[PDB]
């Protein structure tokens, strides 16, 4: 469904649309009044369409057949349609401006105008600020639309989110397909999983989210940090973080590569460990330096403490925890004795690593504020034994 919405949705990716003229050649030409075209949603790959049954929606390309998905921009609502314009080779006349021209969207076949539904009463009581978008014969005067440019960063990020979501969902679907079906002394009996593509995507995204080097100058480093925080927020709002969590959850049920092979085969069992480490590293990259993304774990912190003991990605899980605790005080106020004891057992079982001490130090103080409960629990459980 399509809505007129204001707020952070503006800065979000879901508000991003791509204009696709019906011609392949010279599709980058200047847009022209009455020029038929399709409107694509970047993060979903779906196309604005008019459907007899559900009216204005976004449909898949397979169902986009140029009668539902063909739209034009008109400067005025009058039904002139005096002459269909001839196709032009070259960029052509520069008619429509960014942020100045006022455009009315019209479905070519029906001639309907893009407009809002005039929210029914009690919507104000709900405090719902979003207005469903409809196609209507007359519409409203204010139906005109400014077109605003997006950053190359945002466009790239939206496309990458779309592809990453598709890939990881296919991976998850395969894992669910052979979740509870052992292969025995046979094949896993299912479509080949995209291990290589998943690995390369994970590596590319880690490099994409890599933090700037300290050697950099202050101004450029701050600009890179802005870019990184924005990209993290966009990925989070489009749900990549939850997708990574789901992938990790499904890969965790298998303790080891052999246990994975029993269901998937040795060929994927080899890459099991690499994939889990890459997923944890990507999670750390997404949440590092982002207070909101780190705060999301307040509801589910046990998701990390329960996994701390696992041997395959111990360092990655620990880094995830470190980032979360440095950024978010909410997690610190929800900490518990069970969590502290698990972290101390990590010292006991895995060895004397100063990173655990850094985590425990972060548990005590955040942003100049101390947590007495955490302080006292750490003291009581760690110090007196003296081992």
């Amino acid at each position: 469904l399509v809505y007129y919405e204001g707020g952070a949705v503006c800065t979000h990716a879901r508000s991003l649309w791509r204009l696709e003229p019906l011609r392949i050649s010279w599709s980058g030409s200047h847009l022209r009044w009455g020029q038929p075209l399709r409107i694509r949603h970047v993060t979903t790959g779906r196309y604005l369409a008019l459907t007899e049954d559900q009216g204005l929606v976004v449909v898949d390309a397979c169902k986009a057949h140029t009668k539902a998905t063909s739209f034009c921009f008109r400067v005025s609502k009058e039904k002139l349609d005096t002459a269909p314009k001839r196709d032009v080779e070259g960029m052509g006349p520069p008619e429509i401006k960014y942020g100045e021209s006022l455009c009315f969207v019209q479905h070519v076949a029906s001639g309907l105008w893009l407009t809002y539904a005039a929210p029914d009463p009690k919507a104000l009581r709900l405090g719902v600020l979003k207005k469903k978008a409809i196609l209507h014969q007359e519409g409203h005067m204010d139906d005109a639309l400014f077109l605003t440019r997006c950053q190359q960063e945002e466009s790239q990020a939206a496309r990458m989110i779309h592809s990453t979501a598709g890939l990881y969902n296919q991976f998850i679907k395969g894992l669910d397909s052979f979740s509870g079906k052992p292969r025995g002394s046979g094949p896993p009996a299912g479509p080949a999983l995209p291990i290589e593509a998943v690995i390369l995507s994970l590596q590319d995204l880690i490099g994409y989210f890599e933090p700037p080097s300290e050697e950099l100058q202050h101004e450029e480093k701050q600009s890179k940090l802005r870019s990184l925080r924005n990209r993290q927020s966009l990925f989070q709002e489009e749900g990549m973080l939850s997708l990574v969590l789901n992938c990790i959850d499904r890969l965790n049920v298998y303790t080891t590569a052999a246990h994975f092979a029993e269901y998937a085969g040795e060929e994927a069992a080899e890459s099991w460990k690499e994939i889990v480490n890459l997923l944890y590293e990507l999670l750390a990259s997404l949440i590092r330096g982002n207070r909101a993304n780190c705060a999301l774990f307040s509801t589910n912190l046990d998701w990390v403490v329960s996994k701390l003991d696992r041997l395959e990605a111990s360092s990655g899980i620990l880094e995830v925890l470190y980032c979360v605790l440095i950024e978010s005080p909410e997690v610190l106020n929800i900490i518990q004795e069970n969590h502290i004891k698990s972290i101390i057992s990590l010292l006991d079982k895995h060895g004397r690593n100063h990173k655990v001490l850094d985590v425990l130090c972060s548990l005590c103080v955040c942003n100049g504020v101390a947590v007495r409960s955490n302080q006292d629990l750490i003291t009581e459980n760690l110090l007196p034994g003296r081992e």
């Binding site: 106020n333 103080v365 100049g368 504020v369 101390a370 302080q375 006292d376 750490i378 110090l383």
Partner: protein
Amino acid sequence: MDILELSERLDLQRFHSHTLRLYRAVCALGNNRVAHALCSHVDQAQLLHALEDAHLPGPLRAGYYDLLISIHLESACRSRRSMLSEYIVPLTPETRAITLFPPGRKGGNARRHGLPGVGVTTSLRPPHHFSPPCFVAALPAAGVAEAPARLSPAIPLEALRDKALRMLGEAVRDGGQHARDPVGGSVEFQFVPVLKLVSTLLVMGIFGDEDVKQILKMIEPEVFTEELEEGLLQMKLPESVKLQMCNLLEYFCDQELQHRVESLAAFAERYVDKLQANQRSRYALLMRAFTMSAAETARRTREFRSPPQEQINMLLHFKDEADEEDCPLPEDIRQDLQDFHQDLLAHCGIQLEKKPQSLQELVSHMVVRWAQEDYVQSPELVRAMFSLLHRQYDGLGELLRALPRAYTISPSSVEDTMSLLECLGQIRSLLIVQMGPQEENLMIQSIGNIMNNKVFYQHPNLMRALGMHETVMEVMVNVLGGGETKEIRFPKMVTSCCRFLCYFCRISRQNQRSMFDHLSYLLENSGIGLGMQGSTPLDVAAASVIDNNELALALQEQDLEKVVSYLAGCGLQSCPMLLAKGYPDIGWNPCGGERYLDFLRFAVFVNGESVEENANVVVRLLIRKPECFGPALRGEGGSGLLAAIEEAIRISEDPARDGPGVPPEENRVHLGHAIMSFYAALIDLLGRCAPEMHLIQAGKGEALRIRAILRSLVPLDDLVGIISLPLQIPTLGKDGALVQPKMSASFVPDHKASMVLFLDRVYGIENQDFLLHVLDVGFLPDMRAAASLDTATFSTTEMALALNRYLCLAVLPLITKCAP
């Protein structure tokens, strides 16, 4: 092993250094109990030995220095630093003796400054308190979070002070020789820990005058000689060491400022004595001399009719020398002030060689030389050095900004002031840490002690300078915001947060204005506090606005709109807390609508008269959001007020519609009473917004329009019906047991009083027939009932008391007015 093998065993070095970091973290920010516990694992002997151990790695050396500071010194230094900004000067012989310039042969104005940090200081700083470390002591029977807060562990401060001086001198001398084997492997690791310890001890006040002199000689002997060795400033030191040096210099500059403040206070003592005597003699001589002239006698007497502050201003207005003649004071008294002013300007350096000969020149030249020599890479160091440069160049402005924190007190208030200061230090410490039960108890107890203190009431300007109310508000809000949506914890602390702040506005108008300035913050924090019962930030706001026409007229329509939006949300949605408690689900929250309404009442009604500026705004906002009026008074599909009251009474009779009907608190909400009280508050607020008559006689269109709107909203027949509604009366029955109404769940005379006020202010009683109608329907029956209840058994009943209040407050005055 020997701990010194960690010079080559590096993994162990890192692990142990981070262990020291953890030790500091667990005791960070006031956990004196954890400090005591640590004193067991890392003992005083270990720490002191580590201080002197030259062969340790720098990380371990610094970690042990900082661990000592954290365990023993951090809380005390922070508490003292909090006070250092303030200058509470007792009027004492010691203060009198204080002079900007020590005595000697040179004239004070032209004289060389005395040594910073050396001399007499009378400003009040509360003492440090320490508890010995002992682990064989009897375990208190008292429970956790109720036992008193523990003090920081004790360590021998004079011995530590001497050792710090000695190590600093040794470091200076060896850095003079440029050894290839510095302690810790670096000049940084050699110097920084000692300097941090020394700065902590200075701020704490451990160092004496001679020790300060030795430190000054280490810094720069040539400048601070009192009447070869190389100084740290000449030792060509790295940036972190420079940062510590800057902190030390900041301490000394602060001491110079404090000396200026104290000298000004002493001069004020001495000079006020003379001015008071002169005023007495002059009044006296005027009385002997009133005979000759009347008018010019009047003119001088204008001085004694002036308030004291204006008398001061008049006496001191002789600077320009053009107002000298009009200034009454004689030339000698004037010259005393002029001389002191010149001395002050000289001491601050306004009055105008290669060798500095003063702290200001030393600091300025050092900072400029550092910046010239190298491009500093440390923003913190840059900030500090340029702050010092600013202070040296503008000393008068520093004093000008510091004085607002200066207050002179009699020596007789010293002990109470010190107790109050300790309580305020506790409260200030509570800002940094998260709230808990123990912290809540400490907060409540400190507030109670402060409120018992007489100084709190006598010296409200002192408290406003101290920022007591602001710190209390910061604590309250830090509690409010955290997990606000889920639930509000530590409600007793917020209830205290009024009792303190919310008597505070009553103590003085200036306090009330100070809180009015923070009003919006209180209002935006009010939303959660509503569910909590007792004294609330909305009550703090009401105290800020109450009975002050200036503040009410300065009140903002933005704040009013915020209140009205909250009330609309209340009128549209029920209370989730009540729903969770299992109450019947209605569509709106009478309980919060009532609070917002009485806040608006206090805003619009002052000293018996309406404020039209706020009243009209309230009316307009309320009509624009009419859901605030209630599900009744809605218009379309809306039952009337009278029907609402009747249905509320039926609800009160019927459980499972008045409450959960499956209270320990006994404050259990009764929906019928809540609805009746909401509507009564609404009617009262509308009546209070109603115009005063004199405007109506003047024929002011705005007043007439407002009154017509109010009448349209509330018809008269409904008011009369509510006034006529019967009120249950205590009866004696069934063995002589009293059957008696419950106020919290029943219709009460205050509901009627609101309607009476509305009727009087809006509709008015101008016709005998209507007057008699009201008497025969509603008023007279209630008077008969009250008089019937005027019996020994029934006289003290809450219903009888409520009836008497209702009558005297609303009815009887109305009958008196309508008597003709």
